[PDB]
């Protein structure tokens, strides 16, 4: 009946875009990352969502703007504990307890997946069935390796192993009972306080899954996510939007906000997202690139596999390719080629950069 | 009544384009380099032009194609003497003498200028007044430094001085009397056999001038030459051609052959030349670039300050910038960025190149 969406975190990996807005609130395709999870939780039977915000408590205004659909008015913060925020639910053990006794969800704010949230009870094992499903299944460099046999047990939990194999990792979605919040409230920073060795069956995905918290991970997660959204979002059959401005062609599926304007002959490539009020030039090429909001693009740029931040002003014949994240209010002069260079907010780029790097 | 246009030479400096056609026959703006000089000679009083062709005697067919206007049928070659071809006029001393006794012009085939060819006799000093006029006035690295006082005498003649100052250099256009061809015919290779120390008067440019024999020199000479052509060729007032295909905008003056096709929204930049039968994409940018013939360009490329050879097929969203000469029948894949890379004929480019170099 309640969920704990961990939103407090510096967002160091997605740095060029998180210098302006918290990582939960940077849009993924056309909505903020937390909004997808909040919509899934609205689909399942919960009403109140509590947020543990630490990095930037000024997300309250944006949440109130998005507060119309769901009652997510709850907001708690005293002092920076941890981006992982194990004490997050523990610091708010009183609110979860006295209102209701039902199990409470715990989710990361930078995770995208099918979001099952099944109405099936799954009362023999809470987190084992959900989160990382048992047949997740990717590189072991990031995320915790989970060793689970066919009988849904867990005995090992290593956050960042050096080389331990175990391609299965947690999806980042957890469901806990009221005993967990009362089990280990250490009152300080800790990492998820998983004491799974002690027990099995109590207390503690088939679909795409991606930890959308890094630029390349952002692009790959968008690539995996856009095809799965064709069933429900706006249902001219090549993509979600094919006629918004003039006459443009689309290759593959793409998400284009009806408020955007597209020039004559632009080629919106596979798995691309165009934000609200965005303007796209005559003969652009948006190949697996995300344009956030209010950005303007000249005639003939090819922004490919990169991210264009809010209120940008891209030049006329630029190349923004590889993994190059542009910050807020970044203006790029005509003919500038950016390849894997991250630009901090409020900068003007007039020089070419053929190697990965950072622009202050 | 006769002229000797030196056309025999390997064209090593303009190599990527001269591997297919001799340097005289590579088009400058819309016509071969020799054709401008032949037209100027036709403007002045002369009928027969003799060519000393060494590198490729296959230029005969193209000359016969251009033979309609002028009687340039003469062609002489026995064995490779020199690209400078001092023995050129000397090896054909019999034809110039017996036919006529009038002074004969001598020109380089890679020189562009105002081409005065004044009908004034200027018989007090033949080459002093013409060629390098005395007030040429450029770098001393290339060309011979000519030291001329206000009385029009030549004393020193050093082909490639190390550091001798003397910004004045010869224009490359010479006029000689019948004594020169009978003075020193050594029957072998030599360098212009200039014996100016012996004589001062009659023994033998106020305008733009450029030795168009190098890629960067080609671009700069085209830049200096197109504005001077606005008076004569085709006299919508921004450039020579402004409406040939769809609706495109032009910045500055440019030469576009009526046989070409231009897309909707292309921006033909300052001092650009488009060849016959060439096709330009929807939103290209032709900035100080020359398209030779039959080349096709996709939607949104920016070919800037570079040369695109015959029968090319440029990709859709390329960037051919800096001084990057493309050879005959070179195909470039979409999104390829070429910066100062010369491509030999009959090659396919699919990889980026951010540094000057050669593509085999
Ligand atoms: N940096 C950041 N982290 C946040 C934020 N909001 C919440 N977090 C939480 O910070 C935690 C760790 O930061 P991440 O970079 O997001 O996770 P990670 O360290 O790459 O790995 C963690 O997430 C995996 C999910 O893919 C999980 O394996 C597990 O949470 C792991 O500790 C996550 O649990 C996430 O909920 C934010 O705005 N910024
Ligand atoms: N390489 C080449 N040279 C040719 C060709 N046809 C004629 N030539 C003659 O080859 C001579 C020297 O080669 P260039 O590269 O054209 O001249 P340069 O060595 O840069 O300098 C010469 O030209 C200057 C005019 O700018 C003059 O200073 C003088 O001719 C000097 O030797 C020039 O006189 C030119 O007429 C050709 O197809 N290729
Ligand atoms: Mg994460
Ligand atoms: Mg020359």
Author numbering:
A (entry chain B), B (entry chain E): 9 to 143, 146 to 214, 220 to 250, 255 to 379
Could you give the paper's own sentences about this structure?
A prominent therapeutic target for antileishmanial drug development is leishmanial GDP-mannose pyrophosphorylase (GDP-MP or GMPP, EC 2.7.7.13), an enzyme catalyzing the formation of GDP-mannose by condensation of mannose-1-phosphate (Man-1-P) and GTP. As GDP-mannose serves as a central precursor for biosynthesis of diverse glycoconjugates necessary for host–parasite recognition and is essential for parasite survival, disruption of Leishmania GDP-MP activity leads to complete loss of virulence, suggesting this enzyme as an attractive target for development of new drugs against leishmaniasis. LdGDP-MP exhibits a hexameric structure with a molecular weight of ~245.3 kDa, consistent with previous observations. Each subunit is made of two separate domains, a N-terminal Rossmann-like fold commonly observed in nucleotidyltransferases and many other nucleotide-binding proteins, and a C-terminal left-handed β-helix domain containing tandem repeats of a [I/L/V]-G-X(4) hexapeptide motif, a characteristic structure found in the transferase hexapeptide repeat family.
